[PDB]
Amino acid sequence: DHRGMEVAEPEVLGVEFKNVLPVLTAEHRAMIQNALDGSIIENGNVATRD
Amino acid sequence: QRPERIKTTPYLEGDVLSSDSGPLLSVFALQEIMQKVRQVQADYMTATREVDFTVPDVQKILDDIKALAAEQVYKIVKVPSISFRHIVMQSRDRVLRVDTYYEEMSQVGDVITEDEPEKFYSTIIKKVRFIRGKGSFILHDIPTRDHRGMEVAEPEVLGVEFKNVLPVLTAEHRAMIQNALDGSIIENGNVATRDVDVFIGACSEPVYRIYNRLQGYIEAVQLQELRNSIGWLERLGHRKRITYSQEVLTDFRRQDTIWVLALQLPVNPQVVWDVPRSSIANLIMNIATCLPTGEYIAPNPRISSITLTQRITTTGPFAILTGSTPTAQQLNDVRKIYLALMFPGQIILDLKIDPGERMDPAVRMVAGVVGHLLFTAGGRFTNLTQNMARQLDIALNDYLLYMYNTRVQVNYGPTGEPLDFQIGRNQYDCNVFRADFATGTGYNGWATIDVEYREPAPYVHAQRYIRYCGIDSRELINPTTYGIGMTYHCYNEMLRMLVAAGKDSEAAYFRSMLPFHMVRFARINQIINEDLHSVFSLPDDMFNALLPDLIAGAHQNADPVVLDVSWISLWFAFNRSFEPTHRNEMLEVAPLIESVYASELSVMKVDMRHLSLMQRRFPDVLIQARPSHFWKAVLNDSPEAVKAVMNLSHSHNFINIRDMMRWVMLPSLQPSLKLALEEEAWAAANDFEDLMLTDQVYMHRDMLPEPRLDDIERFRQEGFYYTNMLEAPPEIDRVVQYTYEIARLQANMGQFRAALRRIMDDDDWVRFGGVLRTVRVKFYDARPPDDVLQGLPFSYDTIKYATETTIFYLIYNVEFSNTPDSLVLINPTYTMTKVFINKRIVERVRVGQILAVLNRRFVAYKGKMRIMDITQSLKMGTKLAAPTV
Secondary structure (H helix, E strand, C coil), X not given: CCCCCCXXXXXXXXXXXXXXXXXXXXXXXXXXXXXXXCCXXXXXXXXXXX | CCHHHCCCCCCCCCCECCCCCHHHHHXXXXXXXXXXXXHHCCCCCCCCCCCCCCCCCHHHHXXXXXXXXXXXXXXXXXXXCCCCEEECCCCCCEEEEECHHHHHHHCCCCCCCCCCHHXXXXXXXXXXXXXXHHCCCCCECCCEEEECCEEEECCCCCCCECCCCCCCCCHHHHHHHHXXXXXXECXXXXXXXXXXXXXXXXXXXXXXXXXXXXXXXXXXXXXXXXXXXXXXXXXXHHHHCCCCCCCCCCCCCCCCEEEECCCCCCCCHHHHCCCCCCCCHHHHHHHHHHCCEEECECCCCCCCCCECXXXXXCCCCCHHHHCCCCCCHHHHHHHHHHHHHCCCCCEEECCCCCCCCCCCHHHHHHHHHHHCCCCECCCCCCCECCCHHHHHHHHHHHHHHCCCCCCCCEEECCCCCCCCEEXXXXXXXXXXXXXXXXXXXXXXXXCCCCEEECCCCCCCCCCEEXXXXXXXXXXXXXXXXXXXXXXXXXXXXXXXXXXXXXXXXXXXXXXXXXXXXXXXXXXXXXXHCCCCCCCCCCCHHHHCCHHHHHHHCCCCCCCCEECCCCCCHHHHCCCCCCEEEECCCCCCCHHHHHHHHHHHHHXXXXXXXXXXXXXXXXXXXXXXXXXXXXXXXXXXXCCHHHHHHHCCCCCCCCCCCCCCCHHHXXXXXXXXXXXXXXXXXXXXXXXXXXXXXXXXXXXXXXXXXXXXXXXXXXHHHHCCEEECECCCCCCCCCEEECCHHHHHHHHHCCCCHHHHHHHHHCCCEEECCCCCEEEEEEEECCCCCHHHHCCCCCECCCCEXXXXXXXXXXXXXXXXXXCCCCCCCCCCCEEEEEECCCCCCEEEEEHHHCCCCCCEEEEEECCCCEEEECHHHCCCCCCCCCCCC
């Protein structure tokens, strides 16, 4: 959760980039850290389910 | 003892076969639902979270709910809490008074952090219950004394502790404190027969608000609010037909006793029926507290057999089915049927297809005829699923066509549905016995009005009166027709087509059982709408839509529990009656259970309705706040017996975030003493300085005061002290406003420590607001440690923004052997963190205004007054002398 909306974890994305995060600089570390709070989970519907 | 339980003719007298009870079927119904999900989850490849379906002890829960009605939210003391302490300094004309409530409030909850929102939610809920627990007393039998003819109050019951400032006074000051101490007189104390002692005390403000509301509850809730509760219980005993005593209740209050009543008897049933996914938990509670203890009864053995001389005897048609016995499994399925008839729409049935059994084919064919005149698939409710209505027609379709006598003619129709022909000589149309759930054509309720409405019920939400097969329960004491003409419509058409189908010997067996069969349904109608009438029954706006949602196949929040019976259990359920003998053991303590459990839910809902607004008021501390976090924070500080009622059907694992939020928004409450006291704790906790946790924490570089002392006695009388407690916030200029998001972005790039240095070198301020901080108060006499001096509002681990922040009070201690320029150093000591609170916690007050704090008014019952409790006397079976007009 983040500010009252569900956000998917970075493991459920199809990208593995844990080997990239140690080498990033300061202006680039917060860029990916802010970008992971934009993967908002929508509560859709299929055949009156959730 | 009942006129409907008088047998004169020997027709309704058979053998006692079995017996059920209240708490036997309730554990059995819970065992059978959870055995269905553990069967099919272990037969197919499922994928879900591992949850165990254990059956609890339903009897042990009700003995804990009834034990909850014996507690006391209030308490009785003689002396109130102290609420004000003093600290004597090196001076002898000025001291400083410390409010002990704001000292104690700091050490209640955990340290508030910005990472864990579940601990913050539990922090507020422990500080709120601390206010209710500290401000609920009655002040029975306070001590007094006499002075100048007056009766002044004792210095013990005053909320001031000042016994340490006595020896540091002069002779001109001990008289003024003593004369002001003897001014706290008792109002009109010289008259006798008062029954109350009233004076002027002193206490903190949030503790005083709870004291006035608890006294204000005893101000009004008295005999008339007791007379309404027992007056309502007569309208429930009049419907359930209990037996009263000869003894009555007079409304004579003794002059010495004071009654305290914490519960109200008309329970608002919308509180109970709003718990999310509790449509199975309320059924089990309904059986475990209202179902009578009965015993089945077989029909008379002379019904199916007539003996003429000695060997000339008449043979019954179903002789092999009468000479059978139920096994261990096929007797539980009889209890599954009679649990689906007493609760009409709530429990429906199915077929239980298994290949382990091996029966005659004639058992199935006779179980379609019995099922078509025992159950009900009418237009108002149903006892069976839309599948078993189909499988009970192919059973009847194979019965009418399998003719073992000479064949009667049969004209099939154009379609291919079952029960579509015109059997017999007179050509009875057999199409009407196919099921049709909009009119109910094959089963009971065909031409019968089976649910009616009468005079208004005691419980306001369940007004209906169930009438199986058109038999009002008054027909057993004041009948309508003769012995022969006891007939309803669905049974009457089954007999006039079994004659047409050539089976005129099987029509004779069902015609002679018809006065027995209707008397069974007169007993069931006496148990449904007269004994099973509680809060846990289904309200009308849920019951009237149970059928057309099953047809349309929509999502419903009261899905019927689907049990499953065998094939031969249709026949064994035909030959029983369930004649009740004793009523339930806790039928008389039933309204007190349902008024405690529905009242603690009102404490749970209000405690969530205030915590749910905590995110929008401070969105920087509750960043990771999911609305299940404050669900756990109220359920942990809740009575353990109430939580066991909500989770009988294991509903605490299948509940999502748009269901536990909709229950919070639903308006329904039950007023009690705890709810009327918890609400005034929350109304006095919206300031958030009564919780001692703030957000306006400034930061300013400042020097410790190093005063030059020239006269030891003159400097001692000043009472010099330093503190970082700001008496007023700074100006609107000369301050910068950092937030949480700005101070964390600058700390990632390393530009934050170079930004605080420029503002501190400019001799300005900086506010770290936005987040909340737990604050403590400390007192020191020597030099404090450097972690208290140089404590910053932020810290590292890439920053920690909600660091715990203390307030200190440095009291300077000197002596005669000090140099006049002793404690002047070469490099100063810098203190940074300053906190504004807008609450007069510690103020330096002189001796002349010590007793200027008594401004609250207390009353006190005398020693001859008594405090009894009458909430345990809300039992059902008691009559009062002058009833309610």
